[PDB]
């Protein structure tokens, strides 16, 4: 279900963001998605530990 999260963006698919939005701020949007999914993975890792 974490793959369905937009994390405040306009879409949950990074391909859609890359092919839909201007790269100078699409880099920031992809960075935000990356750090959101990284935080989710860190939460899962701590719970697993």
């Amino acid at each position: 279900k974490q793959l369905s999260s937009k994390f405040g963006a306009i879409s949950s698919v990074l391909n859609d963001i890359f092919s839909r939005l201007d790269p100078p701020e699409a880099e920031v949007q992809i960075d935000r998605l990356i750090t959101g999914r990284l935080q989710s993975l860190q939460t899962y890792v701590t719970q697993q530990l």
Binding site: D22, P23, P24, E27
Partner: protein, 50 residues
């Protein structure tokens, strides 16, 4: 950016570092009959690299 020059004439990469300086040259570079010495491009087969 996105425009006629920002696509086919002059591009700036996302990691560009520096300054851009602009000044009004209407008192010097303009002509009463029009200055045709400066030209710009509008047609190209593909996007011009920065």
């Amino acid at each position: 950016q996105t425009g006629n020059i920002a696509d086919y004439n002059y591009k700036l990469p996302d990691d560009f570092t520096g300054c851009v300086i602009a000044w009004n040259s209407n008192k010097l570079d303009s002509k009463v009959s029009g200055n045709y010495n400066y030209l710009y491009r509008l047609f190209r087969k593909s996007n011009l690299k920065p």
